[PDB]
Design an enzyme around this catalytic site. Structure first.
Site, PDB file in Angstrom:
ATOM      1  N   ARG B  65       0.869  -1.501   0.448  1.00 41.35           N
ATOM      2  CA  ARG B  65      -0.113   0.461  -0.023  1.00 41.35           C
ATOM      3  C   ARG B  65       0.870   1.101  -0.113  1.00 41.35           C
ATOM      4  O   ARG B  65       0.843   1.768  -0.962  1.00 41.35           O
ATOM      5  CB  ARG B  65      -0.800   0.338   1.153  1.00 41.35           C
ATOM      6  CG  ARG B  65      -2.554  -0.703   0.716  1.00 41.35           C
ATOM      7  CD  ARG B  65      -3.673  -0.778   1.517  1.00 41.35           C
ATOM      8  NE  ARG B  65      -3.128  -0.726   3.462  1.00 41.35           N
ATOM      9  CZ  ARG B  65      -3.378  -2.030   3.751  1.00 41.35           C
ATOM     10  NH1 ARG B  65      -3.363  -3.331   3.260  1.00 41.35           N
ATOM     11  NH2 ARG B  65      -2.882  -1.545   5.010  1.00 41.35           N
ATOM     12  N   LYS B 156     -10.935  15.774   4.576  1.00 42.04           N
ATOM     13  CA  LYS B 156     -11.710  15.671   3.995  1.00 42.04           C
ATOM     14  C   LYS B 156     -13.068  14.165   4.174  1.00 42.04           C
ATOM     15  O   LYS B 156     -12.008  13.177   5.163  1.00 42.04           O
ATOM     16  CB  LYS B 156     -11.385  15.111   2.448  1.00 42.04           C
ATOM     17  CG  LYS B 156     -12.655  14.838   1.174  1.00 42.04           C
ATOM     18  CD  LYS B 156     -12.542  13.845   0.695  1.00 42.04           C
ATOM     19  CE  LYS B 156     -13.282  12.150   1.158  1.00 42.04           C
ATOM     20  NZ  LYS B 156     -12.728  11.291   0.226  1.00 42.04           N
ATOM     21  N   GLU B 197     -17.868  17.449   1.629  1.00 41.41           N
ATOM     22  CA  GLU B 197     -18.167  17.108   0.318  1.00 41.41           C
ATOM     23  C   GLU B 197     -19.530  16.009   0.205  1.00 41.41           C
ATOM     24  O   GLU B 197     -20.000  14.635   0.993  1.00 41.41           O
ATOM     25  CB  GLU B 197     -17.046  15.439  -0.135  1.00 41.41           C
ATOM     26  CG  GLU B 197     -17.246  14.139  -0.294  1.00 41.41           C
ATOM     27  CD  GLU B 197     -16.452  13.893  -0.710  1.00 41.41           C
ATOM     28  OE1 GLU B 197     -15.447  13.496  -0.777  1.00 41.41           O
ATOM     29  OE2 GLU B 197     -16.545  12.799  -2.538  1.00 41.41           O
ATOM     30  N   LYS B 239     -16.097  19.478  -1.961  1.00 41.65           N
ATOM     31  CA  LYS B 239     -16.153  18.566  -3.063  1.00 41.65           C
ATOM     32  C   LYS B 239     -17.489  18.167  -3.944  1.00 41.65           C
ATOM     33  O   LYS B 239     -17.550  16.884  -3.258  1.00 41.65           O
ATOM     34  CB  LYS B 239     -14.611  17.412  -2.692  1.00 41.65           C
ATOM     35  CG  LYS B 239     -14.616  16.304  -3.772  1.00 41.65           C
ATOM     36  CD  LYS B 239     -13.439  15.342  -2.827  1.00 41.65           C
ATOM     37  CE  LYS B 239     -13.218  14.503  -3.751  1.00 41.65           C
ATOM     38  NZ  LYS B 239     -11.768  13.763  -2.972  1.00 41.65           N
TER      39      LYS B 239
END
Lengths: 357, 357, 357, 357
Positions: B65, B156, B197, B239
């Site tokens: 990852r 976010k 968002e 967003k």
């Protein structure tokens, strides 16, 4: 013009919560609203026991915590006056003397086991200094479902409101109302009757009138949020503060005044379907708690809901002192416990007599 | 009549968030709104990498990852096109090849380190089947503060809305708006610029018009809740999804139509102070993502905010394939990555040319 | 579960106003937002002319009222600076010197005829003493339709908010917002572009900061109500107060401060689609009105909407004095009128020079 | 931080309506909630009498309208069953046979005179086709004050909601709730006890369940708006529809089902303080009206408020036919009138017997 086929669940008017536990929740509310019974609130934090136990020189340990609770829960005959107990998370997993879990034990005695599912107070970070929100919605269902599996059938979640300068911020009013309303839904979906606790704190120098005005404003919004979330009215309870003068306001309200202001405030805000109101006792003396509830129960104002108690210290104080943390103290502690419980049972029936205290 | 002295903070008109990080949040927003730059969204869950990596026969491990992320984060020169990266929680604690933490590494390269702070989607349990809420507000500040200490400066949080039968429930609209607005406040109090968002999902057979109508309704309420919570407008970003036809609606909108509907929708809802709009790319092809943003940036409609990208797959897809999970694939992967990033950088400037793809 | 077929118009997301006048309303807004032009507000009540005319010893009669208006409306060349005029109900039915109705006359000169459609201020009867609501929604459409038939294409409705002790009641904030939002809808359905006027009054001793805070709170709710009613954003205008210190606060704000606070406040609340902001001038001197608008138009803050004027006294004061109510005074009055109009036209273009006054 | 002295009336928690008529309004509510009494609704429009009278070949004239009303109002002994009458505006100014105005006449007979103060239904212009708002708030106080001066002590205002496809628009729900709540305030300020009428129409093919769901949603918002406006709960009444299957749904609900659904719906929404619920009878037969109210009054569900009737056709139909518009018909008409009134009086007491009809 154009027509569109939608899910009825997408329509605002069809938003009442849909839960397969509906009928059992109502059945639990019927048990929780048994005439002359009330709830014992035994959900004090581990932390709190340190101070609690200092007076009795009992060390704050897991076992001594179990013994404190067992003082009340294994007091034979309490069932005559208590219809359910709000347990602390730790206690849910503790055993009575016969080996049964407390929830098992209570149930077998016909007492409903409940659990405090909130995760505590935190700074609101909106609004005025000293205002606080309540955490615990994250992972709520998983937690509530495991409690249900352990025998719990009802839960308690407390949010507070602090009167300062005669008012509280709209930020608090709305946000805490929203938290309460979401918690009630998730509880119901989880098979737990939610007791919604919007406590306007006794703390301060404010008067009874201010307490009245703030409580009505605060509770009206809790109701507004519960309607927005589609709660099953038939399956929830309220645990509000009574409307009294502030702790440091210098004045003490007579029972009838307290009843008048309290019942009025509720009726002005609570939908008539609300099944029951189990009062919190914070800041009241053991005896006022009983006198106030009795007067409440003699009020000539409208009050279709069951009006009773959900007390902690008001049922426990005398008991703990008599108990003193010793096995030898059980008897005496239990007599004090049973006494208080009886006084409040009478108070729920509006037949309390101060002469009996 | 009577006068009472209160905290100004108890007055509705004085509710704007008060945070000592105000100025640094605005400074971060200035960095995040640098002309011709956008954000790389690298906040994919651990889980997701399993499927992500299948095509390239790369095992989903912690180290692989780290290598996937390092493919992009250590691609020399990406800074010319990316002003900040939304990191996954795991990556925040990972090290670049030089031993620095990713956040340290990015910062030194002048790129702002960000972090996805939401805790994932869960059934809404109100509203229509398939609607979902977002968890993570509990303990938010503690988490955000530790991220801040690690070098993060923005965050976010994503909430979704699923168009079904042409509509979404009011339950979702309100509740998700409330969640977004609270998250934005707590972020700001924690020294993180919040990117809010509210994704209206592309999923379904609905048309562009439906997408338009639902987005405008959804976003208007997100704004209404942000005003209720007193957000620092100057210190947050949006967003949103672009306004396009549904994934299975059978139709593909031309760039100018998408721009028209998108910019219109935003202007109708977003306050003019909103500093920036960093679009999500979900469901768009790498090339449409760029073409759509370019057209957006040529729109004659009002759009005082910076309009740019916050892309994940739209910046990564080609790169991952070329990379193929091998050290030997870095070069090629990085060229694809840099290419996409440049195309979107041009798109932000409204100078994208399809001829370049 | 169950599905039900409904009107799309019954769905919350499909609530935008549907009017066959949509396109003409947008066309009127384009005329009303012509660069370097603004509106002349000539909607003073009959009553008001009594005081207005005292200084000039002009009797307040219907004919003298027509002459006062004709002073400005038949001033050749005003069209270069004025794109529309908000007429008083009486004037709509008055004739210019050539026999045409004022609306006919203006239109032929390319100036849009508008009409003040509110029915005046009344005690709010909720909230704080001195707060006021605005009447006129009853029979609104019938009235607006007859105005439309007479050549009107836009209208004006004013609600006020009175800062007292640094605040305004939530009662006012909500109710007046609701009134404005309903008026805007009915106007649009009637083929009139609505200019929504939420005036936070200059009156008082409050400072610029208080004015800022109250305006932002008041206007944010006007926006929230307009979104609730589904207004056609593309087809309405705002006529707000500028953000300045109170009339009796003892202080005068410099142009740049006024611009900063004003533009900031708007951007924080108004959706980016809002086509135009035509400021009211109440309480400002003729010259400040121009200086303030000019600075507004040089602000570096976001402001996608057209920023211009909708002035009454700020365009008229000098004119009326020079005119003095006499035919012989026309010339002089008209030069003063034209001067002011030019200064404000420059101010809209951000090219005003105090040297020119 | 900073402290500011404000009017208590500027604080959200202190918003309850302040009217010098408070005590008389409560006294009027006590009269209006007299056991075994209900209201006669005689507020039919002039227009309506045309159709009303066709069957009896009575010309629709002012005098014949006075005679129609006098048929009931001068029926000796009606006072035993009717505590107040909602008059039509015209009737307020009409004289009984003895020369007294109807209001004077009723009062002297101990019956409270009331007046329908709404100005009629109009297209909502928001929401779904066929939805309607109610006009009349403009100049409300002036009108209500003149009614008060003429002897009126209570008023009625009706808003409607039309179930279509199983639902109603949120636009309607909110807006009509707002209209009702404002009307109630202005009434109270004017010394008139407001009867708030939110009628969910019987019209349609919907079932009892739909009627239930829509009524609960509609009424909950009426309550929410009344709390927002600070109504004096102790001084208002509700006149809702009963919860029954739709007129064209093909089904007829038994009395106990109607009672169950009705009382449940109310209790779920109405604050316990609400003094009285005077049902409307629209679409029910004279006999169902009585049977339904009786069952309501035998319901085991919570219902602290007085539950009675406010009927028009359900008290009048038989009477008008027997009367036939002729002086000679008075007697017979009056016996029918008195009969119905008695049946409903029994129904209020829960002692109605169908055997008596």
């Amino acid at each position: 013009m154009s027509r569109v086929t939608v899910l009825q669940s997408q329509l605002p008017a069809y938003n009442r919560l849909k839960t397969p536990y509906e009928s059992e929740l109502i059945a639990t509310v019927k048990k929780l609203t048994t005439p002359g019974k009330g709830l014992l609130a035994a959900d004090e934090s581990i932390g709190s026991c340190t101070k609690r136990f200092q007076p009795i020189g009992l060390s704050n340990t897991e076992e001594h915590r179990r013994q404190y609770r067992a003082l009340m829960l294994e007091a034979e005959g309490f069932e005559q006056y208590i219809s359910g107990v709000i347990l602390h998370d730790e206690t849910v997993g503790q055993k009575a003397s016969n080996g049964q879990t407390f929830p098992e034990y209570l149930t077998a005695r016909g007492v409903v086991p409940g659990i405090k599912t909130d995760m505590g107070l935190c700074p609101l970070l909106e609004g005025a200094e000293g205002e606080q929100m309540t955490e615990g919605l994250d992972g709520y269902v998983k937690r509530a479902s495991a409690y249900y599996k352990k025998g719990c059938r009802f839960c308690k979640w407390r949010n507070v409101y602090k009167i300062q300068n005669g008012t509280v911020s709209e930020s608090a009013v709305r946000f805490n109302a929203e938290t309460l309303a979401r918690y009630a839904i998730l509880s119901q979906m989880s098979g737990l009757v939610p007791i919604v606790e919007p406590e306007v704190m006794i703390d301060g120098k404010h008067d009874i009138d201010t307490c009245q005005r703030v409580s009505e404003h605060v509770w009206r919004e809790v109701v507004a949020a519960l309607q927005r979330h589609g709660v099953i009215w038939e399956g929830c309870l309220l645990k509000p503060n009574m409307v009294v003068p502030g702790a440091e306001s210098g004045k003490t309200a007579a029972p009838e005044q307290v009843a008048h202001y309290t019942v009025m405030t509720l009726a002005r805000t609570m939908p008539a379907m609300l099944p029951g109101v189990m009062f919190l006792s914070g800041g009241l003396s053991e005896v006022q708690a009983s006198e106030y509830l009795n007067a409440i129960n003699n009020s000539p104002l409208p009050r279709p809901y069951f009006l009773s108690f959900s007390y902690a210290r008001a049922l426990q104080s005398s008991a703990l002192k008599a108990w003193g943390g010793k096995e030898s103290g059980l008897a005496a502690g239990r007599r004090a416990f049973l006494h208080r419980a009886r006084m409040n049972s009478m108070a729920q029936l509006g037949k309390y007599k101060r002469s009996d205290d």
